[PDB]
Design a protein around this ligand. Structure first.
Ligand SMILES: [Ca+2]
Length: 242
């Protein structure tokens, strides 16, 4: 009922899961104003969320995405040029608006062999708060920063979720493809390759075989590379709606 109305609302707040949101109901926490008077009940995640309830619903215009992506990209150049940073999502695919900045990052330095270089992402984030670009954190791994950026005002913009993800360079491509999407594109891509005698995921591109159980990743220098394995004309990210 109109109470369920609640679990439905709360869940609107980031960090608030269903079971998570469920408890806030038992304690008698319902509206956001209920939230507000109870940060003490919230971990840091749910807290940033309520912070930016508003902003967190507006969408991201592309003019803005661009600006944001220039800043991210430039800084990363400064630290170490060997560093690669692709912005993914709808955005990469010409989308006119979007819901957040999704970044994929890698360094020749780190590969699926390494598996331990949080400083590599971290260095990346700091430069960013150093810049006043990132402005809050949501959570933060040794490989996946989750947070909240903000375009520089001249005088202001909304707060905006951003995610950085460290992926091995041997698995970056597959990874870039994946996060590019779109959903069905991925469905279709994987779909054909399976015909051409290959299996794919965000990590790799591997041959199939007898009984089907098989593998052993193939080399991937580019996104183009993957497409050649499957023998398709490389599809620009635009023509990827499916
Ligand atoms: Ca996202």
């Amino acid at each position: 009922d109109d109470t369920s109305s609640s679990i439905n609302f709360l869940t609107r707040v980031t960090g608030i899961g269903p079971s998570a949101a469920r408890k806030l109901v038992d304690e008698g926490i319902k509206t956001l104003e209920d939230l507000r008077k109870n940060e003490d009940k919230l971990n840091h995640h749910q807290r940033i969320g309520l912070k930016y309830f508003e902003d967190f619903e507006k969408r991201i215009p592309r003019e803005e995405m661009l600006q944001m992506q220039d800043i991210v990209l430039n800084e990363v150049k400064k630290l170490d040029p060997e560093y690669i940073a692709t912005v993914c999502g709808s955005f990469r695919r010409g989308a006119e608006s979007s819901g957040d900045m999704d970044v994929l990052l890698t360094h020749p330095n780190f590969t699926s062999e390494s598996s331990k270089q949080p400083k590599l992402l971290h260095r990346v984030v700091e430069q960013l708060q150093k810049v006043r670009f990132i402005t809050d954190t949501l959570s933060k791994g040794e490989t996946k920063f989750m947070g909240v950026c903000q375009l520089p005002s001249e005088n202001e913009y909304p707060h905006r979720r951003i995610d950085i993800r460290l992926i091995p360079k041997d698995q970056y491509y597959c990874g870039v493809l994946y996060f590019t999407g779109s959903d069905i594109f991925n469905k279709n891509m994987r779909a054909h390759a399976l015909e051409k005698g290959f299996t794919i995921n965000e990590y790799t591109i591997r041959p199939l075989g007898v009984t089907g159980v098989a593998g052993e990743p193939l080399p991937v220098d580019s996104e183009q590379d993957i497409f050649d394995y499957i023998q398709w004309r490389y599809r620009e990210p635009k023509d990827r709606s499916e």
